[PDB]
Each structure stands twice: as C-alpha cells, then as structure tokens.
C-alpha cells in the first residue's frame, strides 16, 4: 500500500502461515512486524491464534496500518530538506513514539490488554504524528510541552489540570512537572488516564442501570472509593513531584482502570438479578 | 556576594534567620539555605539545621551551594546575552529541570535520607552541567544528542554504565536509544545515583582490606560481590527492559544499593576493631 517506507516484514514461516491463513496483505504482515517490536515470532503467533482472524484484522491491523500511514506523512516533513534545522529533533521523537507504541502492543501480545484497548489506544498517536506538520510552520513551539500535543491531549491535561491544581497548587508548578518528564511521559500519562476515565464512565453507567436503592448504593460506594482514590493518587504524585519526593508521575492507572472494569461486571451482572 | 546578586530571594522566617545568624551565615549563605529549601517549610530546615552545628553547616551546605549558584549564575549569564535569543528557552528549560534535580539533593537531606557528606558530593555534580551552557551556545546542534549536555566527568560515568550493560545480544545502539527517550533529566539522575554506589562499594572495599584476613572476612567479602553482582544485574535487566516494551523507566534500585554497602562499611569496620 501506501507503507512503502517500512520494508521490515515477518519471516518466520509458522506466523506468515497464520497471516496468510488470516488473509492479511503484505502491507498488513509489514505492519505486525512493526508492533512486533522485540517479541518474539512464536510468542506474536501465539496470542494471535487464541483470538479469530476475524477480530484480528479490524482490531488489530486495520488501527496500526491508519498509525503507520500518518507516521509515513509526517516522515515526510522530516525528510523535507527545508527542515534540515529540526529535523534531527523530530526524528528523536519519532522513535520515542515508536517505542510508547512498540509497548501498548507488548502490552496486548502478553495479554495485560485485550483486543479493544489496543486498538483504542494506538489511535492516541495518530495525531501526536500529524502534528508534525504544524510544528515545522513555526519551530519555536518545540520547547513547550504542549507545542507538541493535538487538541484532544491538550483537552486531557487540561482535564488532569483541573483535578490537580487548587488553592495551594498552582497552574506554575503544574507545568513545571510537565516540562520536567517531557513529552515521553506527559503523553503516557495522558493515554492511562483515557484509559482510566473510559473504563469509569462505563461502570457509571452500567450502575445507573441497576435497579433502584438494594445493592445499586454499595456499588455506586465503590464507585465513588475508587474514583477518590484514584484522583487522590494524581494529586499526591504531581505534589510529591513539586516536593522533591520523586521524580516520576505514577497515577497508578492500570490497577484503577481494572477495579472500574470488575465493578462495571458486577454492575452489569446485578441489573440481570 | 556579587555572584549571587542574580538571585533576589533568600529567608524570609525570622526564627531561622536567627539560627544562621548564630552560625555566621552570610547573606550568599541565606541566599543558598533558601534555594535548596525548596518548598519543604522553614520548620522543616530549621530542624535539621539545628541539630547539626555552624562548622558542619558552613562547609558541606552552604559552600557547595555557593560555588553551586556561582556557576549557575555564569551559566545564566550566557542563556540571557542577546546573541543567544534563538535558544535562550531551550536553556532555561533545562536550567529549569537541574534546579528540580537540585532541589532534590536537598529534599533526600533535609528529610534525612543523605548526610552532609553526600549532600556536598552530589550536588556539585551539577557545576559542570551548568558550565556546559557555554559551550552548547557555540554549537547548537549538540543539544539534539543527550550526550551534548553532558561533561567530561558525565561522559565517564556513562561510558562505564554502557560497559556494565552492553552485550554481544544488546549493543551500543539500543542502549543509547533508551538514554534519548528517557532524556537528560533522567540519564543524569540515573548518573548521579551510580555514582553513589560506585563510591560507597568502594570504601566498603577499603574498609574489609582493612580487616585482619581470617575468619569473618570472607563472609564480608561474599557480601561485597553478591551486592555488586545484584546492583549490576539490575542495571542490565532494567535496560533490557526498557528496549523490549516490557517498561519506560531506568531503575537500579541503587539507593537501596547505596545503603547496603554503607552497612557493609560499617559492619566491616566493627570487625577490624573486634578482631
């Protein structure tokens, strides 16, 4: 397709069985090799097997071929000899990039996310990709956190913002986090948290659903527990950062955003009773 | 101080003026107990200040601070010539970032998880890491490459990490990539925290030399190689880590690595006496 760019494939015959098996194109086999990272071939068949080619192909392909077109793009304006001044800059970020990436699908081929995680999760970088060319337009941006972020990630840590800085914790030393982690990790943070929010809106509604008063208050309880805690725990790392404490955001999202997922379960299971 | 006439802001707690009085703290001085204060209270300082005496204070605080915003201040005087206007924020940024790492030193301090000799060590780490604002100005280029912001003594240290962790299986290439995505503020950190271990394995080295050879120096001596072993270990199995997917951060638990060996010095100093 589209990849030309990419010209790194899978060559491990019982894979490439299973992709063709799958019926995915070259530039789809391209594709897995990418996300493939440094897993190993047997290991990338091995979770794919267990799933449908079916399910495979939307989730999985379809969403990383959209990322590695965009990356194509916005390689593009790297490559561009007009930007010979930024270009070795962006290309660092590139593959930082493709490292957060190289890692949600670690992250999926162990089995720590399923199907629809990743492909919501990947997408994230979509526009992280695209704002390449805005950047090239006036280069002084680079030097702010948020010169790098699309609307959608400047909406998020404008969301974080807002449970974050108070009376006693202002939008400076806010920022100042920010700009300490880089982008690197400002952006995985943003992702968690989507992830986070996401899997806590579910659980909201699938609680409102259940049958008035009985057991829908002790679940809404829970609800509300794991929520404090959780922005307890954003608001005690980005304190503990302006400290001195740490030097590192941790928001302990996984383990949060799995509580809201049991509890949206016992939410759906309790409306059927 | 003329050299820190840059600075503006200093004590402000009246009771805390009082005690550096009573120490013969100059106005640099206060300049300095106010900088690595950071946002921990006046209590917090005034407790620990206390407790420890003017000789000690005057010499393994407020002197390495000192020379400390000394060079901080040259390095300022570079980020704001006019010349310099095109780069100005990319320096200030990383001034920005040191400060926190400063900060820091004096947080572990102050909070009583480093002493005075630590605190002195580890702070002027960051001089020459100022000092190089002057030559990055001269070629801006350098700064795309994490190890454009390192100094020789940074080099070194890096160098002999990369040692510690590059293989036949993992290689210069992969491992300098986890350096520029992790980025300056966490190489040097991860650098300074290495440098701590190194040192103090080092005087626990000296010190069970020191113990007569015979029954229980060998016992020390295992200890000595099986934390060392643990500690490098770590360092590998982090990178490695980071490369395949499986995390995003370098950690080496060296801290904890740091405390061991200083244990280790003293149980083998005990000894020497005993035996």
Same mark, same amino acid.
């Given at each position: 397709?589209? $990849?030309?760019? !990419?010209?790194? +494939? ?8 299973? !992709? ?13 090799? #990418?996300? /493939? ?9 091995? %979770? ?39 270009? +070795?800059? $962006?290309?660092?970020?590139?593959? %930082?990039?493709? @490292?957060?990436?190289? @890692? ?11 199907? =629809? %995680? *990743?492909? /919501? ?10 704002? *390449? ?6 280069? %002084?941006?680079?030097? =702010?956190?948020?010169?790098? $972020?699309?609307?959608? =990630? ?23 986090? !920010? ?13 968690? #948290?989507? @992830? ?23 679940? /809404?309880?829970? !609800? ?5 805690? #959780? ?5 005690? +790392? *980005?304190?503990? *950062?302006? =400290? ?6 941790? +928001? ?15 939410? /759906? ?5």
């Amino acid at each position: 397709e589209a $990849l030309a760019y !990419l010209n790194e +494939t899978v060559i491990d015959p019982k894979l490439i069985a299973l !992709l063709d098996d799958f019926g995915v194109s070259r530039s789809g086999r391209k594709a897995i090799s #990418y996300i /493939q990272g440094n897993l190993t071939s047997d290991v990338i068949y091995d %979770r794919l097997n267990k799933l449908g080619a079916d399910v495979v192909i939307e989730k999985i392909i379809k969403p990383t071929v959209s990322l590695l077109k965009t990356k194509g793009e916005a390689l593009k304006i790297i490559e561009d000899p007009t930007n010979e001044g930024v270009k +070795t800059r $962006l290309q660092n970020m590139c593959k %930082r990039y493709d @490292g957060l990436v190289k @890692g949600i699908g670690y992250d999926f081929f162990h089995g720590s996310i399923g199907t =629809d %995680r *990743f492909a /919501q999760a990947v997408v994230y970088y979509a526009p992280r990709f695209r704002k *390449f060319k805005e950047i090239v337009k006036n280069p %002084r941006v680079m030097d =702010d956190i948020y010169g790098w $972020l699309d609307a959608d =990630d400047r909406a998020t840590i404008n969301e974080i913002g807002k449970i974050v800085i108070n009376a006693t914790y202002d939008k400076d030393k806010f920022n100042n986090v !920010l700009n300490s982690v880089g982008v690197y990790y400002v952006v995985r943070m943003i992702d968690i #948290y989507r @992830g986070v929010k996401i899997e806590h809106d579910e659980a909201l509604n699938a609680i409102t659903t259940v049958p008035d008063g009985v057991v829908k208050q002790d679940l /809404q309880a829970r !609800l509300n527990r794991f929520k404090g805690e #959780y922005y307890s725990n954003i608001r005690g +790392t *980005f304190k503990g *950062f302006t =400290d001195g404490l740490h030097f590192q955001i941790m +928001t302990d999202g996984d383990k949060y955003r799995n509580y809201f997922i049991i509890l949206k379960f016992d939410a /759906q299971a309790a409306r059927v009773a």
